[PDB]
Amino acid sequence: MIVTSGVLVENGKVLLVKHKRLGVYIYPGGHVEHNETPIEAVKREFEEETGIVVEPIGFTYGIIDENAVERPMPLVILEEVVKYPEETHIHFDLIYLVKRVGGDLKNGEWIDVREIDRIETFPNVRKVVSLALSTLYRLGKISKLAA
Amino acid sequence: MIVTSGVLVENGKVLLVKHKRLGVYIYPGGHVEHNETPIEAVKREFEEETGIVVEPIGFTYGIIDENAVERPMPLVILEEVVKYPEETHIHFDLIYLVKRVGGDLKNGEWIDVREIDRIETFPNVRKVVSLALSTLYRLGKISKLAAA
């Protein structure tokens, strides 16, 4: 079962939302519908859940042609377990790094990335955040020795 | 509408099948069922289409515990446009690099990378194969440095 998520980090803070059933904070995201792409689903769901409009940004090799466009690589992909009383799901999670490009905050909270252990968070959050800091740290670094 | 393909390379040869409707050669793959993960889908389709059993492989960080396990990163992800004068689809194609673990070639052709340019391939297949080769090299070294 395909799902997609958005990691938005601005000024040491990550935007998170409460899961309507689990209650723990999660990266805004959700089920990738059939007739849509994971890129469209993450944009659509980030905005309906938070009010913020984002754009997934990742690495692409640069492959271009009239018949196909390359899409950004996710920050990571996890098969996560979710245990409901009626049943257990496995979610194939395409976790994208995202950027804000519009909207207005309506739901969700900016959680300092250092206080992530002071709140109930979906199991992955802390692991994914570390991965995201590293990556941003690297990119910031490499974006250094460009000159 | 997301689909998945596997790229199997052995002895300077990539395994390609003929597109069901386009005829052109493409790597094996197909639509991902609601009921399955892209990883399960690629093994299933490859299975059906070639008879060979394969295992997706790729870059990972190493995340794994009781609550979640990381899956390998595709080789490349192309959002392909497929014009059948009779519809016209858009395919979010998660393309994985895969290795052989069983089964047996029942259908399909081994395409020598040295002849690929004089062969009718589905758009960008040649670009992707090139990526596979370099990518395989990089996973080769990650693997032997890890072996050291």
TrEMBL record, chain A:
Domain Nudix hydrolase as annotated: residue spans: 2-134
Native organism: Pyrobaculum aerophilum (strain ATCC 51768 / DSM 7523 / JCM 9630 / CIP 104966 / NBRC 100827 / IM2)
UniProt keyword annotations, A-Z: Hydrolase
Annotated protein name in UniProt: MutT/nudix family protein
CDD domains given in the database record: NUDIX_Hydrolase (cd03674)
Record carries keyword Hydrolase: yes
Superkingdom as given in the UniProt entry: Archaea
Tagged with keyword Nucleotide-binding: no
GO MF term set: hydrolase activity
